[PDB]
Amino acid sequence: AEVTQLSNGIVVATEHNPSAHTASVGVVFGSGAANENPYNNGVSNLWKNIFLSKENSAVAAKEGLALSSNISRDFQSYIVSSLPGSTDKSLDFLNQSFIQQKANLLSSSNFEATKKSVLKQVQDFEENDHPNRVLEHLHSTAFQNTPLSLPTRGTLESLENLVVADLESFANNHFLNSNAVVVGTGNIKHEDLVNSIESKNLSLQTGTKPVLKKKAAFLGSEVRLRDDTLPKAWISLAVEGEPVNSPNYFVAKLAAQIFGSYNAFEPASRLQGIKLLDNIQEYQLCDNFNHFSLSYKDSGLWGFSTATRNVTMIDDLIHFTLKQWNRLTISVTDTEVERAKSLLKLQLGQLYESGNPVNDANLLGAEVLIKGSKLSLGEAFKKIDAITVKDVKAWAGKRLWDQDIAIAGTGQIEGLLDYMRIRSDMSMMRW
Amino acid sequence: PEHDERKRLGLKTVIILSSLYLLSIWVKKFKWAGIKTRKFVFNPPKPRK
Lengths: 431, 49
Known about the structure:
part of a larger assembly; 2 chains; A: alpha+beta; Cytochrome Bc1 Complex, Chain A, domain 1; 2 domains; 6-stranded mixed sheet; 16 helices; 12 strands; about 40% helix; B: mainly alpha; Single alpha-helices involved in coiled-coils or other helix-helix interfaces; about 65% helix; about 0% strand; rod-shaped
C-alpha cells in the first residue's frame, strides 16, 4: 500500500485499500502511561471506558457506528468504524466527543458506574491472568523510578483516589493538536477526508504539552511473588534492547526469531529447527515459551517468557536457554540466519496486512507520531535481506555477552536460584 | 644453620598470603551484596482459600 501525510494545521494520514468493505476514522494521541505519575496512574484507562460507555455507544449504534480504543505506554487511540458510504457521520460523532462536549460524558452518574467497572477489571487481572501480570512486573523492576515502569491499566490503590477533576486536568495538558494525528484506513480516499475536515474548522487544543523530566534507565534487578497454592511457575527474563529509530531495530527482531516460540502439546511445534528443543524435550522442562523484542521511544527489552509444571528442574531450563544465547556471539550458523529471515518476513506480513482496518489505524498513527512518516513493507524486506552473520555477532557482543538482567516470577518458584547463579550464565568463560 | 634463609623465605610467604587475604575480603563482599540489601514485604491474603 501507499500512505499520504499532510499538515494543514492538523496532521492527516491515510492508507487507502479499494478491496475493503469498511472504513475506520479516528485520532491517535502521542501520550500514554509513560506520561503519568504514580498518583494518577490509571487516568488514561478511565478515558477509554468513558468513551465506550453505554449511553455514548447507544448514540453511535443508531447511525451504524462501532467504537474502539486502546491504551499503551507511548500512545492512545479512539477509533470510529462505519460502512464505506457513511464516513461523513463518523467525523461528526468524533466532533461532539473531543472537540466539543466532553462534559455530558463526565456526569456524576456516568463516572461512578464507570469507575466501579474498572476497579473490577484490574482486580480480576491481578488474580487470574498470570502470564501478563508477570510481564508487567518485569517492566516495573527493570525501569524502576522512571516513567516506563508504570502499568497501563493502573493499580487498585491509585484508581480509588481519582475524581473528575483528575480527568479534566489530564485532558487539558495532553489532548492537543500538536500531539495528535487523524487517521483513516480501509475504503476511504485521502482527499475526501481532508476536505471533510476543512469544511468544519476543527481544532482540539493548541499545543505545548509538558516536558517529562527523567529519561528511561535500565537497572538489573529481580522481583519474586511466591504463591505455593498455584499449579505452575511463570517466569520472564530480559536484557536491555533497542528503541525505535535505532539502526539495530531489525537485527534484534531477527535474533528473537532464531529461538522463537514453542508449544509442547502441538505436534508440529515440536519439529521446528531450533537447537534448544533437543535439550528441553528429553525431560519436558516446560509447556511453552516465547521470545520477544520490545521497543519504545526511549529504551527496549529483549528476552523470553515461560510457563512450566516441572517445578524441580527449573534451574536446568534457565541454564540451557542462556547457553544458546551465548552462541550468537561465538558460533551461529548461516543456516540459522536464513531461516530467521524468511519467518520474520512472514511475521511482519501478517501484522501489517491483516484484514482489520482498526489494527492498521493503530499502527499508522503510532509510527507517524514518532518518526514523521511510515516505512513501507517493501523497504523493510530489503533491510532484512541484507543482514549477515557478522552483524548478529556484533550486536550480541554488545547487548548480551556479560550483561545485567531483569527477572520476574510468580507461582512455585522455590527452585529458581539466586541472581548471581543466573547472571554468571550470560558469559561462557569455558572459552 | 638455616636461620638466615629461613627468615628470607618467610618474608616472601607472609607478603603473598597477606595480599591474598585482603583480596579475598573484597571479592566476598561484592558477591554477597545482593543478599545483604534484599527487601521483603508482607500483604495478608484474603480469607477464602
